[PDB]
Swiss-Prot record, chain A:
Inhibited by FK866. FK866 competes for the same binding site as nicotinamide, but due to its very low dissociation rate, it is essentially an irreversible inhibitor. It comes from Homo sapiens (Human). Diphosphate binds at residues 179, 230, 294. One of its GO terms (molecular function) is nicotinamide phosphoribosyltransferase activity. Belongs to the NAPRTase family. The modification Phosphoserine is found at residue 455. One of its GO terms (biological process) is signal transduction. This is Nicotinamide phosphoribosyltransferase. It is found in: Nucleus; Cytoplasm; Secreted. Homodimer. Pathway: Cofactor biosynthesis; NAD(+) biosynthesis; nicotinamide D-ribonucleotide from 5-phospho-alpha-D-ribose 1-diphosphate and nicotinamide: step 1/1.
Swiss-Prot record, chain B:
Catalyzes the condensation of nicotinamide with 5-phosphoribosyl-1-pyrophosphate to yield nicotinamide mononucleotide, an intermediate in the biosynthesis of NAD. It is the rate limiting component in the mammalian NAD biosynthesis pathway. The secreted form behaves both as a cytokine with immunomodulating properties and an adipokine with anti-diabetic properties, it has no enzymatic activity, partly because of lack of activation by ATP, which has a low level in extracellular space and plasma. Plays a role in the modulation of circadian clock function. The keyword Phosphoprotein applies. Expressed in large amounts in bone marrow, liver tissue, and muscle. Also present in heart, placenta, lung, and kidney tissues. Changing residue 160 to S: In a colorectal cancer sample; somatic mutation. This is Nicotinamide phosphoribosyltransferase. Pathway: Cofactor biosynthesis; NAD(+) biosynthesis; nicotinamide D-ribonucleotide from 5-phospho-alpha-D-ribose 1-diphosphate and nicotinamide: step 1/1. It comes from the Eukaryota. Diphosphate binds at residues 180, 231, 295. The modification Phosphoserine is found at residue 456. It comes from Homo sapiens.
Length: 469, 471
């Protein structure tokens, strides 16, 4: 079972002995520090509040387990047993913490307060930063959701330019990342974050997480279709690739079906197998049930362009109302190898230059989508900005000489709309002056309870692109 | 609760309809594919997966029904192999009819070798082998963390031995700072445990419980830490009182090593004029067991380390060790734990060496670089079907994409062997059966729902030792 007393960085065990004597308040905040990626989608806090922070999180057994572990880990008795016991006894093991946060799905420029944390009992001054470690992990769903939304912006731009509309947008970036993340837990968190922006996923773990922690009106938040893998083609033998293809598209004759076509020779597969031997099985398919040809190797742009050129010579191409070429409706491509935000841009731009509509393609992304991301992409960071010691509040901050980008904010913070409707973070308690209206942060956790929450449907609404609105 | 029926890539739900008819066996393997440097990989983490997710009764009627219900909506179609999952429930009380054979954990194996194989033990469950690809391929993560951590240990060992003449302290020279910087609690425990294969210092507490539960150590714990400050504990004093914070902290922890982040405002002033003058008397009186460890945390990591050492060498008595390298007094050391990854680590120790500073002077912390800034394509960790039985005939299967020979997979039944010169070879096409190469190094570790062979964390560490530590 999870034990919050064992879910912090080791050094934080020792911090209660380091703050100024008679400190009754430690007040901290989270931002995606300013330094590409100008605005971040705030998502994932609610998962952490519910799974890890709410309710009775301290027990006698957890305190004893922690004590025993830390005694050996530090080769010394430095653990605040009394401090944890106080929480157990006074609050029935509910954390005396208040968290205020911007609504989930909100899209906020860099360098703004996203949430704040403070203790609600003077005895628990040390608890605010105990829980930095677990809260800072919100970087991950924030960053996944942000980077996925940034890819959506690219796809929207190019789809609108090449087709005149956004039809199909929220299926154009499919999550392939389940195997390529670091754990089952990560898989669910990251896949949920991608689903803020798109509807297509193979990372099944995302569905249960959303259902449990956020909720949707629809039975599920994301969808998939049948598709082949190398094992299901290659198992037939090298000389029987055509047989595998015929079997699979016949098994799935009335739903869209993706078929990995590069086991031996993508270009032969497209030109000869699909384009000649099995063409009669493709041209007969419903518009609601296309064959989706999947290359999976080689230079992504060059491979997509060559696959399209092949198919456009074997199948009847049309020219849409914008002047771009369009495969027949029973035939599409999915490129799901080497896709990240940079190659995504390269591919759609190269397709546009060769007069191929983005309607012809969808993308899959695995590691690029869910794994090839770090906390330093958006500089997601938690810092103390205010303390009260001997009854006096002081504004506190770091400001390292050699790196002004690491300067932190001072004092009590609030988030506001400017007169032009942008965001601003007021420091030093200046929000109290009421020159910029009401604080946009809401209390979402207090004293062991989640006090405000968002459905997944609301999060999605909040995270929509302008071009969509 | 975890449901293995919902723990696969969605498309794999449809694959039972795609394999050739009359297929009784699907046999697949995992490797860290070679790429025409990370030449060798530490095999670690499978045992976690086997125990946590794969062993015992993993199928129930309720799990079947919930998968069925989710998949109907997710696919907008009924494609789920309810019959096949029910078969396992009724026939094997929900235990997976799968055999997995693996190289022992901690083993260090060159790229492009079989590390483990998976096959179904019941013909009806031909589809189950690749169902569990997704969950098993996540072993990429502990392998990669353990590998990348070991490659960093190789760099540290080289420069420590050069600058000092020995490896003392090596075991503590790369500390895990990564708990906040990973994507989840579960990742934290897995990655931290992988780093501890190579080192003994960690602040990622999650790693300890994982090792205790799934591997085990003769010692009470596998990893250790010391007291240390963060910006909050310094800055909470007010800037004008940074010296008061330092004094308070080193006096609180006067008898153990203590790390004190020193860059809140001006790292150079803190070193030269706070530690180097105002509080010097509290540092020179410390035990060799209980040094002050000054922690910069900003600026160019090499430049900052070199400037910090230059300042400290002017304020504190420096000696020259027997190799000619400068050494701080024993009550004073440095920890650099900003911007550290395998590339910057190398830069910093080389820069130190060029300026005649012993690596004895320094330890490193690494967070995102150690545990998060890694992907499955670093070592090309990959799982592929290499053998099937169809109509009772075994056939060697493989991929070989025309545009990428690096993605060619191995053929047939595989086995891993020592070569006559003591290297490793993977034999393909069942050639291991010829017995020209001594015993297969793959052992059965899972069979029909049971974990059949386990390794302690101690054994894993032994297996993963560096040669230089052997020598
Ligand atoms: N306009 C346009 C253009 C392209 C297509 C379409 C269209 O019909 N759809 C949009 C795409 C949507 C999903 C397709 C997933 C296919 N699945 C795979 O390829 C699975 C691979 C995989 C690989 C590795 C790991 N896990 C899974 C089906 C509907 C429309
Ligand atoms: N030769 C030599 C050279 C350098 C030192 C030493 C020496 O005494 N040791 C080696 C190092 C070992 C551990 C020190 C960790 C200190 N912890 C921190 O700085 C924690 C920071 C942090 C930051 C972010 C997230 N989590 C934690 C103490 C023993 C010997």
């Amino acid at each position: 079972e999870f034990n919050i007393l064992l879910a912090t960085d080791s050094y934080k065990v020792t911090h209660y002995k380091q703050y100024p004597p008679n400190t009754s308040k430690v007040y901290s905040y989270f931002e995606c520090r300013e330094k590409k990626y100008e605005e971040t989608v705030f998502y994932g806090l609610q998962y952490i509040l519910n799974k890890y922070l709410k309710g009775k999180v301290v027990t006698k057994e957890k305190i004893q387990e922690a004590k025993d572990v830390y005694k050996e880990h530090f080769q010394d008795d430095v653990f605040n047993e009394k401090g944890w016991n106080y929480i157990l006894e006074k609050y029935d093991g509910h954390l005396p913490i208040e968290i205020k946060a911007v609504p989930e799905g909100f899209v906020i420029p860099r360098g703004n307060v996203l949430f704040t944390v403070e203790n609600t009992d003077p005895e628990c001054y040390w608890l605010t930063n105990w829980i930095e470690t677990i809260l800072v992990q919100s970087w991950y769903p924030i960053t996944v959701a942000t980077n996925s939304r940034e890819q959506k912006k690219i796809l929207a731009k190019y789809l609108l330019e090449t087709s005149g509309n956004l039809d199909g947008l929220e299926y154009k970036l499919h999550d392939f990342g389940y195997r390529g993340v670091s754990s089952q837990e990560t898989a669910g968190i990251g896949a949920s974050a991608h689903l803020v922006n798109f509807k297509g996923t193979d990372t099944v773990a995302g569905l249960a997480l959303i259902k449990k922690y956020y909720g949707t009106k629809d039975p599920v938040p994301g969808y998939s279709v049948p598709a082949a893998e190398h094992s299901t083609i290659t198992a037939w033998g090298k000389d029987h690739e055509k047989d595998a293809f015929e079997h699979i598209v016949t098994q799935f004759s009335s739903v869209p079906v993706s078929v990995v076509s590069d086991s031996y020779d993508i270009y032969n597969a497209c030109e000869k197998i699909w384009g000649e031997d099995l063409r009669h099985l493709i041209v007969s398919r419903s518009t609601q049930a296309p064959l989706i040809i999947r290359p999976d190797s080689g230079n992504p742009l060059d491979t997509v362009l060559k696959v399209l050129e092949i198919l456009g010579k074997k199948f009847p191409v049309t020219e849409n109302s914008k002047g771009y070429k369009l495969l027949p409706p029973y035939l599409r491509v999915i490129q799901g190898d080497g896709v990240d935000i940079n190659t995504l841009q390269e591919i759609v731009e190269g397709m546009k230059q060769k007069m191929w509509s983005i309607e012809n393609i969808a993308f899959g992304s695995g590691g690029g989508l869910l794994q090839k991301l770090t906390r330093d992409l958006l500089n997601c960071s938690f810092k103390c900005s205010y303390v009260v010691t001997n009854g006096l509040g002081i504004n506190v901050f770091k400001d390292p000489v050699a790196d002004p980008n690491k300067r932190s904010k001072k004092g009590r913070l609030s988030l506001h709309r400017t007169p032009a409707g942008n965001f601003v973070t007021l420091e030093e308690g200046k929000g109290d002056l009421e020159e910029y209206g009401q604080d946009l942060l809401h209390t979402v956790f207090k004293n062991g309870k989640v006090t405000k929450s968002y459905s997944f449907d609301e999060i999605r609404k909040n995270a929509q692109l302008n071009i969509e609105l």
